[PDB]
Design an enzyme around this catalytic site. Structure first.
Site, PDB file in Angstrom:
ATOM      1  N   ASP A  63       6.438   8.924   0.713  1.00 30.94           N
ATOM      2  CA  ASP A  63       5.739   8.554   1.932  1.00 30.94           C
ATOM      3  C   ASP A  63       5.512   9.715   2.885  1.00 30.94           C
ATOM      4  OD1 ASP A  63       4.810   5.800   2.026  1.00 30.94           O
ATOM      5  OD2 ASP A  63       6.896   5.239   1.719  1.00 30.94           O
ATOM      6  N   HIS A 122       6.370   3.664   7.102  1.00 39.35           N
ATOM      7  CA  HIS A 122       7.353   3.668   6.033  1.00 39.35           C
ATOM      8  C   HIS A 122       8.336   4.807   6.269  1.00 39.35           C
ATOM      9  CE1 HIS A 122       4.279   1.586   3.130  1.00 39.35           C
ATOM     10  NE2 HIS A 122       4.507   0.902   4.236  1.00 39.35           N
ATOM     11  N   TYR A 141      12.496   4.723   6.791  1.00 40.58           N
ATOM     12  CA  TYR A 141      13.546   5.418   6.046  1.00 40.58           C
ATOM     13  C   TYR A 141      14.512   6.095   7.015  1.00 40.58           C
ATOM     14  CZ  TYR A 141      10.230   4.738   2.194  1.00 40.58           C
ATOM     15  OH  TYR A 141       9.348   4.200   1.278  1.00 40.58           O
ATOM     16  N   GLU A 159       1.076   5.334  -6.359  1.00 45.98           N
ATOM     17  CA  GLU A 159       1.096   4.042  -5.684  1.00 45.98           C
ATOM     18  C   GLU A 159       1.504   2.894  -6.605  1.00 45.98           C
ATOM     19  OE1 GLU A 159       0.661   3.260  -2.695  1.00 45.98           O
ATOM     20  OE2 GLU A 159      -0.347   4.903  -1.647  1.00 45.98           O
ATOM     21  N   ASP A 211       2.840  -3.435   1.528  1.00 43.91           N
ATOM     22  CA  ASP A 211       1.800  -2.491   1.907  1.00 43.91           C
ATOM     23  C   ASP A 211       1.297  -1.746   0.678  1.00 43.91           C
ATOM     24  OD1 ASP A 211       2.074  -3.064   4.652  1.00 43.91           O
ATOM     25  OD2 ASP A 211       3.601  -1.520   4.909  1.00 43.91           O
ATOM     26  N   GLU A 212       2.224  -1.313  -0.174  1.00 49.24           N
ATOM     27  CA  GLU A 212       1.833  -0.569  -1.360  1.00 49.24           C
ATOM     28  C   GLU A 212       0.920  -1.363  -2.279  1.00 49.24           C
ATOM     29  OE1 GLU A 212       2.052   2.486  -1.388  1.00 49.24           O
ATOM     30  OE2 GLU A 212       3.168   2.348   0.491  1.00 49.24           O
TER      31      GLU A 212
HETATM   32 FE    FE Z   1       1.337   3.635  -0.220  1.00 52.78          FE
HETATM   33 FE    FE Z   2       4.485   3.947   1.580  1.00 55.84          FE
END
Ligand code: FE
Ligand code: FE
Ligand code: FE
Ligand code: FE
Ligand code: HG
Ligand code: HG
Ligand code: HG
Ligand code: HG
Ligand code: HG
Ligand code: HG
Ligand code: HG
Ligand code: HG
Ligand code: HG
Ligand code: HG
Ligand code: HG
Ligand code: HG
Ligand code: HG
Ligand code: HG
Lengths: 340, 340
Positions: free
Chosen positions: B84, B118, B122, B204, B237-238
């Site tokens: 990310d 994202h 983390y 992805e 989201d991915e």
């Molecule tokens: Fe992504």
């Molecule tokens: Fe991501």
């Protein structure tokens, strides 16, 4: 020589805001300048959706507006649409490749993202007040007066981007490209970036606010309330954006970041002053077109000019520049209830 | 030759996704391809804030974990963080200078923005489970087993970016730079973009998903549940991000957007296939290092190796590539509880 993930383990707290090692790991547990992390948090807390705003009555209001008032309203909207179209992509394309600290990298991307939301809100407004949005959008590109008012914005970003590419590709030095001598000076590139930021500051600090005044003039007479709610939300975002640019600029001036940038801020002080004066004149000149078919009570060329001078002095003072205009009180104090 | 606001009035519905006239006006009332607008809408509707997820008990869970399991969890989290970090900036720096339709431009900026969230999540997790986050973040840049893939991913982006600069600066042709011949071919640039997009699609659609299995294996045991909630939101989201790259690639290879791109795709089809297998092999070799000290409930070298082949077949089939592995049903259907 740009890289999406620099492999050198560097101390991000010691990198300069710009021109240092490109950011590798995106971390937010620490930062060189907490102000950018605070701005990210603020902008995220302000997240809003344009399509949620009820603009169902704006069509009735707009349609019933006298012709010259439609002209004023729509011309202003088109300029706002132009600005956010440029601001949605430019910070990412022009600044992102030059940032060397994670908090600033993410702030720029967040800032740019928020501008795309603004653009989406203009489509929401436009599509709901006119039969054919294409006429409005197409005119933004071809309107000589709109482009004359914005002249200098895209050109500055474009030059910076071109100079940046030369730097990343060839590095510092004097080169020979297709038989021509091309000089790549980092100091010159820093000057371009610096003046670009000052220009963006003026765009944020003045250009947007002049347009807010025109938008809220309608809100004052209880018309275009959907648009008013949207502009209030956009204004709240722009306030954060200009806080961001004022801090970037003043931190560079302080000499606490890249020492060379502090030298540059001082050496280029007149250019900073000049661009503000130029931007102010452009905003004033726009009035001749804005009110070509007539003015409104409380909104005319004279009032617009007084406001431009008023806000320009405030914004220039905020970044340490001398004031070019006569001091005066707010010519439109009613704007306060709509801002923040 | 890139511009932040092309002054030519053009029909944005007729421009190709890439290499056409740079996008001037950001409008969303119409689109050449509806999918990108729908993706923008969905992504905005999925906006979430990591700080709102309770990770207060992940600390104790992590400390209680056997040493080899701590290694599995933290190594996986470091890889997600790396992915990310790259994805927050790269789509913007690499694609924006090449996009020619508004819906795709804004989708890319929205997509990139979602990745910064994202990255922020983390930090939220890491700072709540180790006392000294720096040890974790620094290892991301220097970790040999991680940087392998990092360099491979960055390479595709970095080369595309470099070639794009040459193209914008010099145009097509045979040029000379400091005594060396520099050839710029739009065809070669298109191939670069296609390869890059395929690589992002694998990132992805495969790299992220393997990491999800690694993360949800803990969730199945009611451990690291704060992390689980966050990874669940990230995986949502991915799914959108991979949908976006799959449409881009399919539109480019079918020939409905640009005949030249369709021609190129078929041309480097074998390269694309090996590119995918390579990526799958890398994730396989990683699973190794992950369990070099033991396995855990629900996951081991072989089961993860199986999942990689399972997902790879599916993803490769989606973009018109042959299946490199023998077909089988999902090795870990329990993971479906956590995915879209
Ligand atoms: Fe992504
Ligand atoms: Fe991501
Ligand atoms: Fe804006
Ligand atoms: Fe702004
Ligand atoms: Hg700028
Ligand atoms: Hg600029
Ligand atoms: Hg105005
Ligand atoms: Hg005004
Ligand atoms: Hg200067
Ligand atoms: Hg200055
Ligand atoms: Hg005046
Ligand atoms: Hg790419
Ligand atoms: Hg790529
Ligand atoms: Hg993993
Ligand atoms: Hg896994
Ligand atoms: Hg290919
Ligand atoms: Hg591929
Ligand atoms: Hg296998």
């Amino acid at each position: 020589a740009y890289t999406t993930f620099s492999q050198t383990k560097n101390d991000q707290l010691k990198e300069p805001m710009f021109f240092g090692q490109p950011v590798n790991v995106a971390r937010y547990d620490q930062q060189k300048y907490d102000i950018f992390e605070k701005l990210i948090e603020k902008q995220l807390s302000f997240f809003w959706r344009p399509e949620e705003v009820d603009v169902s009555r704006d069509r009735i209001d707009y349609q019933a507006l006298p012709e010259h008032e439609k002209h004023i309203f729509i011309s202003n909207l088109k300029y706002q649409t132009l600005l956010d179209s440029i601001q949605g992509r430019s910070p990412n394309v022009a600044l992102l490749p030059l940032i060397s600290i994670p908090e600033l990298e993410t702030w720029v991307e967040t800032w740019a993202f928020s501008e795309t939301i603004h653009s989406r809100s203009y489509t929401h407004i436009i599509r709901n007040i006119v039969n054919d949005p294409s006429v409005v959008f197409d005119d933004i590109v071809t309107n000589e007066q709109i482009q004359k008012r914005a002249e200098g914005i895209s050109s500055y970003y474009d030059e910076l981007i071109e100079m940046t590419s030369y730097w990343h590709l060839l590095g510092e030095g004097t080169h020979t490209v297709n038989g021509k001598t091309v000089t790549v000076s980092l100091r010159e590139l820093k000057k371009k970036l610096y003046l670009c930021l000052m220009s963006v500051n003026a765009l944020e600090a003045i250009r947007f606010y002049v347009s807010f005044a025109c938008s809220f003039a309608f809100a004052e007479r209880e018309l275009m309330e959907g648009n008013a709610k949207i502009i209030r939300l956009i204004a709240r975002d722009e306030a954060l954006h200009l806080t961001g640019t004022q801090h970037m600029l003043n931190l560079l001036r302080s000499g606490a970041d890249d020492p060379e940038m502090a030298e540059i801020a001082e050496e280029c002080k007149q250019e900073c002053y000049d661009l503000f004066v130029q931007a102010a004149q452009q905003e004033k000149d726009w009035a001749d077109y804005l009110f070509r078919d007539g003015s409104m009570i409380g909104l005319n060329k004279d009032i617009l000019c007084q406001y431009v001078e008023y806000i320009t002095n405030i914004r220039m003072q905020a970044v340490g520049l001398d004031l070019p205009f006569n001091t005066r009180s707010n010519p439109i104090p009613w704007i306060n209830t709509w801002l923040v």
